[PDB]
Structure 1
Amino acid sequence: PQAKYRHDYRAPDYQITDIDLTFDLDAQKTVVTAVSQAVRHGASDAPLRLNGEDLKLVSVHINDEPWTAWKEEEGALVISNLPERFTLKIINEISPAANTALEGLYQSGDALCTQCEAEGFRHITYYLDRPDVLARFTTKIIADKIKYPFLLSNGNRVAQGELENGRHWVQWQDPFPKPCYLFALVAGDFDVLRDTFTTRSGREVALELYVDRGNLDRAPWAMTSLKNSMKWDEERFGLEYDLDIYMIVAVDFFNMGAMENKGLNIFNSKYVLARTDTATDKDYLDIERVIGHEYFHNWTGNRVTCRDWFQLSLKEGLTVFRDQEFSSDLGSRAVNRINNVRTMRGLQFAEDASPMAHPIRPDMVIEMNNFYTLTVYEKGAEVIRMIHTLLGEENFQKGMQLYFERHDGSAATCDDFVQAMEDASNVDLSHFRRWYSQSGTPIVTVKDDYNPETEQYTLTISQRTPATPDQAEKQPLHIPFAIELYDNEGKVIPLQKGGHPVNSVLNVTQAEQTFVFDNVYFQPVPALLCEFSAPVKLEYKWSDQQLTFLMRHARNDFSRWDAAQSLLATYIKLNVARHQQGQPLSLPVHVADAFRAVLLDEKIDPALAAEILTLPSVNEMAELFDIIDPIAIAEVREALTRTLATELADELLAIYNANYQSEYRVEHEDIAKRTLRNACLRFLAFGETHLADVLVSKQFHEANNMTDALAALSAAVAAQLPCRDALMQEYDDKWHQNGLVMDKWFILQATSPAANVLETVRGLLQHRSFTMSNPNRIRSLIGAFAGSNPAAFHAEDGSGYLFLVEMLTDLNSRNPQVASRLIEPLIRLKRYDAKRQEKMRAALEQLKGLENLSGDLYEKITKALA
């Protein structure tokens, strides 16, 4: 498989302006007729190269003449000797039932559905499958009326008919030009939740949510969230929906979360279906964010699309930023910011140090499905957020308005976006553009001085980005570095220099620079990189008492949490070193005391308390170390949990009881109290065993909603309490017919600290609720083991590696996209000790030798082994 390079982009030799599709649908053999109106822009000797994969060509006509000047080669139909303007007609066959990879047109249970992003439309017919070719689509669908009573495609339903032999047809027209990755087709039988939303200007939009028969009771929250999304995009960004119908279809077989196909979004059912006995608070908030995300793509992705796939972050960074803003505006902005920072530091930073490191705008791709990444998405959003920090809301909105004014109806680049922001705001972003071209996490080092004679505070800030596997050359970035200075009473010291206020967002643009502040009337305690103002590692030599001071006084809730993280980090590092010498945990009492103060502070928001009381994950802890010891990290996390549970036992129980709520509501104050209560329970589960077992068993049985039931079950597994097996078995007996609910249980099994966890995981491959044909089941059992149980995955005997090789040997042939997601823990081999490296390298060499190695895996394996 061949690399493609961003610098090789060229405008296409041909455009298509209009495509009329007919599908004669059948799960075994579908016949596609595609009539495209085309225009040749290049030279007469440049042939038309149409992408096509696994298609059976039936016929090719040019202006209704059977065409003899063509050939088929690997992945392409190459058509020569064409006029300047012509009608292309292709007929071809495909087989949805054979499509296990879930790209193109495939089967989801008894439904037929599509996924075309990035390059799936070429699995449906021969086409210019590239996102800088926009065309107006019409789609006619012909099918068996009993099996497929609903026949959906993008746009408006413009025609309908009945045929002989129990067949019917519908035709759809989507008036907005689109690239083909935005095409969708759905055929099947569903229940339909119907509602309406009236836009700010008075357009009435029909809303239709298609779910599997019997699931209407699980649809209203997603409907509510769609309406909320529509209203919010009007209020925040001034954006209205542009069609008269908005369709969402929930399907059980889907590789990612959802897909923004124009007017016909297709969703993994995980991010649609919710009822209080089946879904947690987090599931409700995820549904809200993913419904929002796909909605927001209607402008940032659909109305303006991507020139080429290197520009993916143009839509993904900006749409993630939008979904974060939505969630943050509706919910707790602090909890949102905290969680997104956890993801960046604990998962994205690791990618940026890995063999798959890339800039948010990649320069080189072999398989584009490998680049739907933490980096493109989450770091992409941080980059957009930096623009927001530099411009402020008003200028940022002006940049959005200029971006749409220039590029509405076209395919654009990341550079076009940055230029719109610069031109509308008058802020220079020439240096800032380097965040698009440079991979790796910058390390910002801060040293400071207080001069009591002049009342000056001096900050010397330096930056460096280490070389990454993809880039040997690194340069300084334009880093927005937000600060605040606190006096001894916890009040903010005004920032000023030479009699003038100074903006608290410092522009760190050099390898090293100094900033001097005047009128600093007391030796300050600084809050540094406030609200994680740039996606960087911070090196500053905090004292523990500066950190506990910030936990108490800092103005933004984020800084309070982050100070607590820095306080913990030091003692995590200590305790991993101690573990490796066989010593027990050591922790100064003033640390336990800082957490006791949080638990007993009556003025603190319970949402914030809960996040302070949620220890860093094993992934976040891993990022503290040059060489990861996953066993020591897991054991230290547990021991820190046990120690705090013992030290804070009375306080934990008091807060647990005080946050009891008899009614369940999906409402931010209620969620916050319940999240705190459950954080207390999780510590309590690691305390005295009898009381633990009683609290946990009782919560599980009395819970009137899945958030509280799963928090209990999860605590029983984590702490290996006596009730564990009985509770787990009850869950299975109650919920085995419900795959989404069982995913939660598979995750608990896969992440269990029990000694025989691998053996249980292998056994669960035969469980009545498991199947290798379903990406959700695969991720919940296999993926959770490999990704979220690093202590077991990284068992010294190599057994976790061998297990993953076996699974991936199947998945390489069945569903390479899922295979590539699952291989990720193995490509991190350089972060581990020599003996684990040896074994992981041998696993990777084994996979490298598979027959029919997919491009998806080949890319990752070759980078990892280099």
Structure 2
Amino acid sequence: PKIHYRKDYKPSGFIINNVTLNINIHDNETIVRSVLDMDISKHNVGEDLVFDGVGLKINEISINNKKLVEGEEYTYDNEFLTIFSKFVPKSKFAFSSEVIIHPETNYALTGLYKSKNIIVSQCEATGFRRITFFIDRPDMMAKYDVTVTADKEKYPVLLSNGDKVNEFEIPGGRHGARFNDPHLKPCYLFAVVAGDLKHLSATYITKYTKKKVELYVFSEEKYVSKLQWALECLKKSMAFDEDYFGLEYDLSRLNLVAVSDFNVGAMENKGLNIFNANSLLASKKNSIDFSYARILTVVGHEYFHNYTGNRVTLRDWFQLTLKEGLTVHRENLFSEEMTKTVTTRLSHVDLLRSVQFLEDSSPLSHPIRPESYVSMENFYTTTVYDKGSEVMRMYLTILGEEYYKKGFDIYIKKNDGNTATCEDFNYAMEQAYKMKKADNSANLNQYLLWFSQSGTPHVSFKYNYDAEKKQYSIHVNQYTKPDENQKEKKPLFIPISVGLINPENGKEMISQTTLELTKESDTFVFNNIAVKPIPSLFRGFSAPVYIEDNLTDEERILLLKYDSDAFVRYNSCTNIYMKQILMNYNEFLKAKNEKLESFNLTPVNAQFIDAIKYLLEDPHADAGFKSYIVSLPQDRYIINFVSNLDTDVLADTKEYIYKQIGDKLNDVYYKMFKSLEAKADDLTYFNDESHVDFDQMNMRTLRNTLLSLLSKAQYPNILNEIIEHSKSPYPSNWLTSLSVSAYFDKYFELYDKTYKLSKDDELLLQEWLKTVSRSDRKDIYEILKKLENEVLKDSKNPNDIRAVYLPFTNNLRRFHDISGKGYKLIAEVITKTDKFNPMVATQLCEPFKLWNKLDTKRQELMLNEMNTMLQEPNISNNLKEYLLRLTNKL
């Protein structure tokens, strides 16, 4: 395989200053004419001029109006256009090409493609080369003049980046529009859209310079009614970047556009952000609650890239985390601010410690700045994004808000209009650190290990209290497991946000403080500690690590009830559940393997259950928080703690724990389910697509979590409640009625009822598909076949394929059926999908990432299917690299 290495970065021998494009859309072809105004750089050594260009049909090639001929002045192999050096000018020159491409058959959704009746582009990372020839790498920055032409009836709205400088008619019922983007950019930020689009618009006035910006949001006509919340979230995003970061938008217009067929969430093309419709479009009668959160985060994310990615871009793709990690951190800050609910930060932590920790213990483990790749696309990972965000967030923890803001401003100004590297960011943060420490010898050189070292650190603690001296010590150790990336792991700079709780009264004993652990181990000592405390460690989840608190369950319960920090409270609960899960798992496992006729199970701690009841009954405690405490840890979290995991044993473990707690709490759960109804399902704001009450949404979440618990329990007459719930105007509620009815004969009636409610809205139907797919049904395999035949059919829409299959893959009992039939079904979907969309096929590989954590029969079955996929003729480079890495061959 062709391997690119971070250390081998070199600047190009060429410069592209201006790009002038004419994109002429017709029914069965698009013609792209492109002039590149180029020059020779100071790094040039008279090399051949090599352009990326994939799947292009060449009409003509010229340099300075001299036609070039295949075999004589150039070669083209369908991937690279090579202009022999004799024909490459030695000073400024014009390169012209005209190629033909076919969006109407581009089902890979990269380059220029058709999504329903909209023509749209996706260029990040390597898509621009599928539109026209270029030196397709992010350090090749240029200014763009783009003309789009098309049939006017079919494609009345034409957009590209930047200012629309002209619009004109063309004979034969066509028309054109010309765009000028004045900001230098890499080609990955180019976009064009053509469609029969409708819009909502508003004018935003910037805070400092009072610049008028016209905001447009666009969709197909059918769904124009679903654009309003996106527009509001854009206004919120713009205000937040002004208010926190002092950053103002930099063009007269910003367009956001929803398309039905999109590989991921959205894309930050300058002035022309393009979204998966599931991440831009909602209405309260037609969307579940989680859509509102998702749109807020994704709009925010793309908007924040306008500085972190666009105005300051990447030197090379190994720097991906510099824009994605930093943008996710900005997006998280924004979301926390907008929602004002503690469950926001918790949700980010839950995702990291489940999916990202799994990745980091897998054969796919990489540092947030990888050292190599074959397909850069396989590095758009939860590591690069979510661990990257936690690495970006630790700078804020270490510096505090004022000095963090200073460092960020150093970075953003210094590198404006240019490329940057992770080192540039660390250098800016290090300038702030020196100022904070008032010591120009302080440095953050150790911090760089967070970019280069893979794997999750393990941090463990020991405590000692001397009552005569009123003196308390916290001794801390860190360990990272050696791996394929580093055989010897070095200690990191780990910030440990800490409090100390008095167990006698539940109160805070110290000003919160941040311990800076820089060695493999260290002991932090506190004086004037009046009684033995219970430590409150890694407040806010202050570093991306495995925490071993070495606390008793009695101490954990005291923190769950009385600590101030939502993460420590949640983590203390998590830890009590993990101790129980591992103990019961081992009990069940021994019983199974020893074929015992009788055995014991350790009961769930009765004081913990009493604590759960106390919190649930507190009318002043948070509804969202409550929903986390009655839920066991996610399976992907649990599996980080078990080797050779028997998934059936784990399923039996979780069922036993849930049943123990419900046997004590179900009546509490029912009383709460009823008592929360009035406030949860209040219709204030039901017609207001500009405002969401996130606390009220967390109440619905709690109700729906409780309803699931009671339904699984067969609580008496709960079917009555399920049927009433299916009549609620909130889709979150009526789709929950379908999933919780899985435990009853009424499931197929609710399946039909909710289908009819869902089938006329593309996105609501996809949410119905997910609801069916995750249903806890013994007959799930026959239900999947019914979805395939009756609803999915031949769809190539990634959202339809993902909706049908991914939730089902999280069904611990059924997906991991010891026959292997679950593994076979998903492997067939992967292979099928790879024939037209390699990026989506690699997404669908997700359940296989934990293969080497499973018991040896399941390991063998997963491995069999992975190797079968690898044998498929014409397997994509994306899928083949992924699977070779995952199976320890690469």
TM-score scaled by length of structure 2: 0.94
1:309-355 superposed Cα distances (whole Å, 9 cap, x missing partner):
11000010111001111110111352111111101111100000111
1:403-429 deviation line (CA, Å, top 9, x unaligned): 111101011111111111112331621
For the Cα contact (< 8 Å) 1:359–1:375, is it kept in 2?
Answer: yes
The amino acid that maps onto 1:7 is K
**Deviation larger for 469-478 or 277-286:** 469-478
Judge which range, 625-634 or 399-408, deviates more: 625-634
Worse-matched range after superposition: 559-568 or 451-460: 451-460
Distance (Å, rounded) in 1 between the aligned partners of 2:536 and 2:644:
29
The partner residue of 1:647 within 658, 664, 681 is: 664
Letter in 2 for 1:229: S
Q: Indicate if the aligned counterparts of 1:20 and 1:34 stay in contact, CA closer than 8 A.
A: yes
Which is worse superposed, 222-231 or 663-672? Answer: 663-672
Give 1:205's aligned residue: 213
- 1:343 aligns with 351
Is 1:663 the counterpart of 2:667? The answer is no
Which secondary structure state, in structure 2, belongs to the residue aligned with residue 532 of structure 1? coil
Structure 2 distance, partners of 1:245, 1:165, is: 30
Q: Do 1:15 and 1:39's aligned partners in 2 also have CA atoms closer than 8 Å? A: yes
- Equivalences for 1:443-454 in 2 at 5 Å? 443-454=458-469
Moved more, 847-856 or 667-676: 667-676
Letter in 1 for 2:185: K
Find out whether 1:516 has 2:516 as its counterpart: no
> How far 1:590 moved relative to its partner?
1.4
1:76 has 2:80 as partner: yes
Structure 1 segment 569-718 matched on structure 2, within 5 A? 569-580=578-589, 581=591, 586-660=603-677, 661=679, 662-665=682-685, 666-701=692-727, 703-717=728-742
Contact 1:120 1:181 in 2 (8 A): yes
| 2:93 counterpart of 1:86 | yes
Deviations 1:205-255 (A, max 9, x none): 111111111212111111111111111111111111111111111000000
Work out whether residues 110 and 122 of structure 2, in 8 Å CA contact, stay in contact via their aligned partners in 1: yes
1:585 and 1:522 map into 2 onto residues whose CA distance is 33
2:164 to 134, 157, 164: 157
SS at match of 1:814: coil
Question: What CA distance in whole angstroms lies between the structure 2 residues aligned with 1:546 and 1:267?
Answer: 46
Number of residue pairs aligned between Structure 1 and Structure 2: 855
Residue 491 of structure 1, aligned match among 502, 507, 523:
507
After alignment, is 258-267 or 466-475 more displaced? 466-475
| Cα distance in 2, alignment partners of residues 315 and 220 from structure 1 | 28
1:771–1:777 Cα contact (<8 Å) kept: no
Taking the TM superposition and a 5 Å limit, the aligned residue runs for 1:704-853 are: 704-717=729-742, 720-786=743-809, 788-853=810-875
The alpha carbon displacement at 1:308 in A equals 0.6
User: 1:388, 1:417 → 2: CA distance?
Assistant: 13
Q: Report the Cα distance in structure 2 between the residues aligned to 1:140 and 1:573, rounded to whole angstroms.
A: 62
SS of alignment partner, residue 327 of structure 1: helix
The reply on whether 1:186 has 2:193 as its aligned counterpart is yes
State the SS of the aligned residue for 1:458: strand
* Aligned 8 A contact 1:827 1:861 in 2: no
2:604–2:661 CA contact under 8 A, matched in 1:
no
Mapped partners of 1:789, 1:148: distance in 2: 44
- Identity of aligned pairs, percent? 35
Q: 10-19 vs 42-51, which deviates more? A: 42-51
Aligned residue number for residue 30 of structure 1: 30
User: Where does residue 500 of structure 1 map in the other structure?
Assistant: none
> What is the CA deviation profile of residues 421-474 of structure 1, one whole-angstrom value per residue up to 9, with x for unaligned ones?
112331621101100001100111111111223222122211111022433231
Question: Cα 1:129–1:261, aligned 2, differ >3 Å: closer, same or farther?
Answer: same
* Paired AA for residue 21 in structure 2: L
Match of 1:253 in 2: 261
Is it true that 1:435 corresponds to 2:450 in the alignment?
Answer: yes
After TM superposition, the structure 1 stretch with the greater mean CA deviation from structure 2, 554-563 or 226-235, is 554-563
Q: Following TM superposition, by how much is the alpha carbon of 1:111 offset from its aligned partner in structure 2, in angstroms?
A: 1.0
Deviates more, 1:371-380 or 1:37-46: 37-46
Contact 1:15-1:38 at 8 Å conserved across structures:
yes
Residue 584 (structure 1) shift: 6.2
Q: State the alpha-carbon separation in 2 of the partners of residues 738 and 659 from structure 1.
A: 29
Q: Deviations for 1:748-805, whole angstroms, at most 9, x for unmatched residues?
A: 322233222123213321223554301001111122223x223322111111111122
TM-score in terms of structure 1 length: 0.96
Contact 1:310 1:361 in 2 (8 A): yes
Q: How does 1:270-281 map to 2 (within 5 A)?
A: 270-281=278-289
Classify the secondary structure of the residue corresponding to 1:549: helix
How many angstroms apart in 2 are the aligned matches of 1:823 and 1:608? 32
Deviation at 1:44, TM superposition (A): 5.0
Q: Secondary structure at the match of 1:779?
A: helix
- Structural mapping, 1:47-86, within 5 Å: 47-68=48-69, 69-73=73-77, 75-79=79-83, 80-81=85-86, 82-83=88-89, 84-86=91-93
Within 1, Cα distance between the matches of 2:714 and 2:772?
23
Alignment-mate amino acid for residue 736 of structure 2? A
Q: CA deviation at 1:45?
A: 2.2
Decide whether aligned partners of structure 1 residues 43 and 679 sit closer, same or farther in structure 2, where only a CA change above 3 A counts.
Answer: closer
1:180-202 Cα shifts (integer Å, max 9, x gaps): 00000111101111222111121
- How has the CA–CA distance of structure 1 residues 678 and 424 changed in structure 2, closer, same or farther, with 3 Å as cutoff? same
Q: Which amino acid counterpart does residue 117 of structure 1 have in structure 2?
A: E
Output one character per residue of 1:557-597: Cα deviation in whole Å (capped at 9) or x when no partner.
Answer: 22222211112111122222233336667313212111101
Determine if contact 2:473/2:526 at 8 Å carries over to the other structure.
Answer: yes
Query: What is the alpha-carbon distance in structure 2 between the residues aligned to residue 459 and residue 474 of structure 1?
Result: 23
Given candidates 101, 104, 112, the residue that maps to 1:97 is 104
One-letter amino acid of the counterpart of residue 76, structure 1:
F
Distance change >3 Å, CA 185–CA 361, structure 1 → 2: same
283-292 or 455-464: which moved more?
455-464
2:595 counterpart residue number:
none
Aligned-partner Cα distance in 1 for 2:542–2:849: 30
1:353 maps to what in 2?
Answer: 361
Using the alignment, how far apart are the partners of 1:183 and 1:755 within structure 2?
A: 48
SS, match of residue 768 in structure 1: helix
Distance (whole Å) between structure 1 residues aligned to residue 772 and residue 701 of structure 2? 22
| Larger displacement relative to structure 2 (670-679 or 2-11) | 670-679
Maintained 8 Å contact 2:111/2:131: yes
Q: Distance in 2 between matches of 1:43 and 1:115?
A: 31
CA distance in 2: counterparts of 1:334 and 1:162, whole angstroms = 54
Question: In 2, Cα distance between the equivalents of 1:91 and 1:146?
Answer: 26
After superposition, the C-alpha distances for 1:607-639 in whole angstroms (9 at most, x for unaligned) are 322332333222222223223232233333334
Is the partner of 2:800 in helix, strand or coil? helix
**Aligned equivalents of 1:568, 1:282: Cα separation in 2:** 26
Amino acid at match of 1:552: K
Aligned partners of 1:742 and 1:769 also within 8 Å? no
Q: Deviations over 1:138-161 (max 9, x none)?
A: 110111111111111000110111
Aligned positions of 1:118-129 closer than 5 A: 118-129=125-136
Provide the aligned C-alpha RMSD in A: 1.7
In structure 1, the residue corresponding to 2:18 is in which secondary structure? strand
Give a deviation string over 1:39-62, Cα, whole Å, max 9, x none. 111335212110010011111111
1:122 to partner: Cα distance: 0.3
2:574 is matched by which residue type in structure 1?
A: Q
CA distance in 2, matches of 1:767, 1:578: 44
The alpha-carbon deviation at position 668 of structure 1 amounts to 2.5
- Specify which of 302, 307, 325 is matched with residue 333 of structure 2: 325
Secondary structure of the structure 2 residue equivalent to 1:246: strand
